[PDB]
């Protein structure tokens, strides 16, 4: 048998984990019982940077502890430096599920290129959610929002936060931060997070406004090293990758349902949904375009400008 050991950031019993287990079972079907995946909690083995180290063996001729991993942009960006994967986090570049799917479908070869060059096959792309601003107070312009002190607690908060700070937002790095007393005390003005966070933490109760225009997705990539993928007979590869694409599509479907649910529940609890008109979105994007030039200057390599232009053309032509 070929049991592929896969480190994963997917929480136990989460939709991502459920679908990845289905993918394993389907891979077993496809391969006549030969191949399966066993998943290992990423945090429990030491985090994403440790996961990267465990993809390589300690001595030549010896198998690496892991065959692959499901990484956030933290792991992806450190595995392949100057990948440009943070291009996908540019504010307002990718705003909805239809458009993210179009990018992940049409620009797959471009997205995968730096990972292939690093010695990995990208099995599937998925998404952890959509970053949005949740605030105690409203804002009359993007600049006014940028002046608010906003906590970010994503898995990749440090780098993502640095990007947003260059854009001009007063983002306060806040890993596992216990925001409730801080929101209540007024030490911070709000938070930037995916939907589930706002609901599961209960922090929605301590803010009054939620921006419905999504800032960016939080993409996730599942990678298998070339040597581990090569353990699988080639005749099965295409079917296995097609099954992994269906995982992306089912997950996006399930995530969208969960997100709308969350948003409905936040609104029922009294949070006001902030709705930007197309003219206001354009005003925001014109400013974000200037922020992109500042990111290019301040953090060369962070953005892949060829990919950026391709995404703009694909979605907005």
DSSP per-residue codes, 8-29: E-SPTTSHHHHHHHHHHHHHHH
Cα separation of 71 and 55, whole Å?
A: 12
SS3 content of the chain, % helix, strand, coil (to 5): 50, 20, 30
Give one DSSP letter per residue of 198-260, joined into a string.
HHHS-GGGG--EEE-S--EEEEEEEEEEHHHHTTS-GGGHHHHHHHHHHHHHHHHHHHHHHHH
In this structure, what token pair is assigned to residue 268?
A: 């029922």
The Cβ-side half-sphere exposure at 284, using a 13 Å CA radius, reads 24
- Nearest-CA neighbor of 189 among 227, 151, 244? 151
Neighbours of 161 (CB within 10 A): 22
Cβ burial 224-251 (10 Å sphere, 16+ → b, else e): bbeebbeebeeeeeeebeebbeebbebb
Neighbours of 111 (CB within 10 A): 23
Experimental method, per PDB record: X-ray
Judge contact between 127 and 255, C-beta under 8 A: yes
> Helix 15-30 crosses helix 237-268 at what angle (to 10 degrees)?
160
Burial of 142 (0-12, 13-18, 19+ CB in 10 A): buried
Query: Looking at domain 1-317, what is its CATH homologous superfamily?
Result: Bacterial extracellular solute-binding protein, family 7 (3.40.190.170)
- DSSP lists the bridge partners of residue 274 as 211
Query: Pairing mode, if any, of strands 35-41 and 149-152?
Result: unpaired
Burial of 85 (0-12, 13-18, 19+ CB in 10 A): buried
Cα separation of 166 and 313, whole Å?
A: 24
Ramachandran bin of 190, using left for φ above 0, alpha for ψ from -120 to 50, beta for the remaining angles:
left
- DSSP lists the bridge partners of residue 69 as 7, 223
């Amino acid at each position: 048998k070929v049991v592929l050991k896969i480190a994963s950031i997917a929480p136990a019993r989460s939709i991502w984990e459920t679908e990845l287990k289905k993918l394993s079972a389907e891979w077993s079907e496809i391969t006549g019982g030969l191949v399966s995946m066993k998943f290992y909690d990423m945090s429990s083995l030491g985090g994403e940077r440790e996961g990267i180290r465990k993809l390589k063996s300690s001595r030549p001729g010896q198998a690496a502890p892991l065959d692959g991993a499901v990484f956030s942009c933290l792991g992806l960006s450190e595995l392949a430096p100057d990948s440009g994967i943070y291009t996908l986090s540019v504010p307002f570049l990718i705003q909805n599920e239809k458009d993210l799917e179009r990018v992940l479908h049409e620009l797959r070869e471009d997205l995968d290129r730096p990972f292939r060059a690093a010695g990995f096959r990208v099995i599937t792309w998925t998404n952890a959610g959509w970053l949005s601003f949740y605030t105690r107070a409203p804002y009359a312009s993007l600049g006014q929002l940028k002046k608010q002190t906003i906590a970010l607690s994503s898995l990749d908060s440090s780098v993502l936060g640095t990007c947003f700070r260059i854009c001009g937002f007063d983002i306060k790095d806040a890993p596992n931060a216990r925001l409730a007393p801080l929101l209540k005390a007024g030490s911070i003005d709000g938070f930037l997070s995916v939907h589930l966070f706002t609901w599961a933490t209960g922090f929605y109760r301590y803010i009054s406004y939620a921006l419905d225009t999504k800032i960016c997705p939080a993409v996730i990539g599942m990678l298998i090293s070339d040597g581990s993928w090569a353990r699988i007979p080639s005749r099965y590869h295409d079917a296995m990758l097609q099954a992994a694409t269906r995982v992306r599509q089912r997950l996006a479907n399930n995530l969208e349902t969960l997100d709308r649910e969350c948003s409905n529940n936040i609104q029922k609890a009294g949070v006001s949904i902030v709705h930007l008109t197309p003219q206001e979105i354009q005003e925001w994007r014109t400013e974000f375009a200037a922020d992109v030039k500042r990111i290019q200057a301040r953090l060369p390599g962070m953005l892949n400008m060829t990919l950026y232009e391709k995404i703009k053309h694909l979605l907005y032509s």
